[PDB]
């Protein structure tokens, strides 16, 4: 089983990606890129990451989006003047009311973008790098089969992941405990998947993404690269038992494991998904199929 | 946010089955021994810097409200067991504990083995490795099961200087939360501080390693209910800050645990970087779902 794992770092997996821009350009072979950055009041960060990636926009990017999840700080005006498209959550999809939380924020980017691969990145960075998304696009357009990059950070992955994920996929999806950092925001996808997979709620979208990739499309889909050496992020433990109880609500959801909805008393938790965007989107689903 | 079912249950539980200030004294609870007797017990494995120190603050009940107090060595190389002699306990290895059947790894195994070789009807753990205990540890955690009618486990838990670790707030109180969430009303269900009666532990299986507590805790809960768990505080302790390797460990093995009590199978694959053992009572030695 560890012969599983290592064939697919073999082959799956980069800590040391070469690829340049010019080269991933030349490989798009008439394919479309779509940057997406979720957004709920991140004033201090989103312009820098934006700053980042606009160089690539009318190149290897051809969409840079911030989706904006009702923010009231200076947010918006902020990643417009880096060179984003600032996109509410009503503009995206105004039919359908919002709920709250990140997976309803790109799930509802689907329908406001037109990539063939979509491109997620954080708002909240505070360390930005240029190549963040060459890195994330790589195994789609030059490796074959992949559907699913997932960015991972080499450290100088933190407790809700070595505790909570890693060993919970251990026990519920053995083979996924290959990937090194299966919460990271920093993630791409081809439309065929995205347009076709429910998103799950809240902090659960991340892990809900991948397992359903998994059970889909298997393992060779899933592709990670380091994106760079990162520090642990500190949030406070209330945070982090918030996210690690809908991350087990989604895994419970994924398997079909009855899950009491009950939240930590401090929290959040929905055990519904969004169904996937071609029931709503069917003709621009359709439209975006090779 | 209008109060869950949960939460109403939580709050009737904390009135009834929780004490902040449990503060009988040793006196009285000896008093309300009618007969029973208290048998202590610290699970050990290579704590020679800790053990006696432990053995120590419980000593001195010895002959009053403790009938027995014994570590149960699980196979230290270092000078645990001696030092426990000379501390005033009675050391007892898991073979003599339990001669018929081989040990397996683990602390679990320790506090199975201990119902043989004790002989209470009150069982107290304690573990070996604290590095401050307070001689009124054994007193609080039995209090509730000699004054209070019903009770059978009593969970010791910790104030925190100005509830529980990482393991505890991320992996078992929102896993509990989810599969058994009346069980989330326990402040600190992985402490190692724990006393129950030889009637309840001797007929539930016991989890292996880091995965007995919360075995307990939850086999206790679908037999009995909320009504027979109690909780104490113990005092002010700081949190133990264990390697990541180690929590990563104990939180598998939780999981493992839980999901065998919850209807969750588990493919038995340890970390990417041993089963419970029968009720006692099959070895040595009413709440019910219908009308």
Same mark, same amino acid.
């Given at each position: 089983?560890?012969?599983?794992?290592?064939?697919?770092?073999?082959?799956?997996?980069?800590?040391?990606?070469?690829?340049?821009?010019?080269?991933?350009?030349?490989?798009?072979?008439?394919?479309?890129?779509?940057?997406?950055?979720?957004?709920?009041?991140?004033?201090?960060?989103?312009?820098?990451?934006?700053?980042?990636?606009?160089?690539?926009?009318?190149?290897?990017?051809?969409?840079?989006?911030?989706?904006?999840?009702?923010?009231?700080?200076?947010?918006?005006?902020?990643?417009?003047?880096? !060179?984003? #498209? /600032?996109?509410?959550?009503?503009?995206?999809?105004?039919?359908? $009311?919002?709920? @709250?939380?990140?997976?309803? =924020? +790109?799930?509802?980017?689907?329908?406001?973008?037109?990539?063939?691969?979509?491109?997620?990145?954080?708002?909240?960075?505070?360390?930005?790098?240029?190549?963040?998304?060459?890195?994330?696009?790589?195994?789609?357009?030059?490796?074959?089969?992949?559907?699913?990059?997932?960015?991972?950070?080499?450290?100088? !992955?933190? #407790? /809700?992941?070595?505790?909570?994920?890693?060993?919970?996929?251990? $026990?519920?999806? @053995?083979?996924?405990?290959? =990937? +090194?950092?299966?919460?990271?925001?920093?993630?791409?996808?081809?439309?065929?998947?995205?347009?076709?997979?429910?998103?799950?709620?809240?902090?659960?979208?991340?892990?809900?993404?991948?397992?359903?990739?998994?059970?889909?499309?298997?393992?060779?889909?899933?592709?990670?690269?380091?994106?760079?050496?990162?520090?642990? #992020?500190?949030?406070?433990?209330?945070?982090?038992?918030?996210?690690?109880?809908?991350?087990?609500?989604?895994?419970?959801?994924?398997?079909?494991?009855?899950?009491?909805?009950?939240?930590?008393?401090?929290?959040?938790?929905?055990?519904?998904?969004?169904?996937?965007?071609?029931?709503?989107?069917?003709?621009?689903?359709?439209?975006?199929?090779?």
């Amino acid at each position: 089983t560890d012969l599983a794992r290592h064939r697919w770092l073999t082959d799956n997996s980069w800590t040391r990606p070469t690829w340049t821009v010019a080269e991933l350009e030349a490989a798009k072979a008439g394919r479309t890129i779509s940057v997406v950055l979720p957004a709920l009041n991140e004033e201090e960060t989103v312009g820098g990451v934006v700053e980042t990636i606009r160089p690539l926009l009318g190149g290897l990017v051809d969409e840079l989006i911030v989706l904006d999840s009702g923010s009231t700080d200076d947010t918006e005006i902020r990643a417009m003047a880096a !060179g984003a #498209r /600032v996109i509410s959550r009503e503009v995206a999809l105004p039919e359908v $009311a919002p709920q @709250p939380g990140k997976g309803e =924020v +790109l799930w509802r980017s689907l329908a406001a973008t037109t990539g063939d691969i979509i491109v997620f990145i954080d708002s909240d960075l505070i360390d930005p790098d240029p190549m963040f998304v060459p890195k994330l696009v790589g195994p789609l357009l030059l490796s074959e089969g992949v559907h699913l990059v997932k960015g991972f950070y080499r450290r100088p !992955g933190g #407790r /809700v992941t070595e505790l909570v994920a890693r060993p919970l996929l251990a $026990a519920l999806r @053995p083979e996924l405990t290959c =990937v +090194l950092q299966p919460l990271g925001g920093e993630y791409a996808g081809t439309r065929e998947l995205l347009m076709s997979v429910p998103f799950a709620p809240g902090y659960g979208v991340e892990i809900g993404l991948l397992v359903d990739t998994y059970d889909r499309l298997g393992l060779d889909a899933i592709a990670q690269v380091n994106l760079g050496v990162r520090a642990h #992020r500190n949030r406070p433990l209330t945070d982090l038992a918030a996210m690690s109880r809908q991350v087990i609500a989604t895994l419970f959801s994924r398997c079909g494991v009855p899950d009491s909805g009950v939240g930590l008393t401090q929290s959040e938790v929905s055990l519904v998904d969004r169904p996937p965007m071609n029931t709503l989107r069917g003709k621009l689903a359709a439209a975006l199929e090779h």
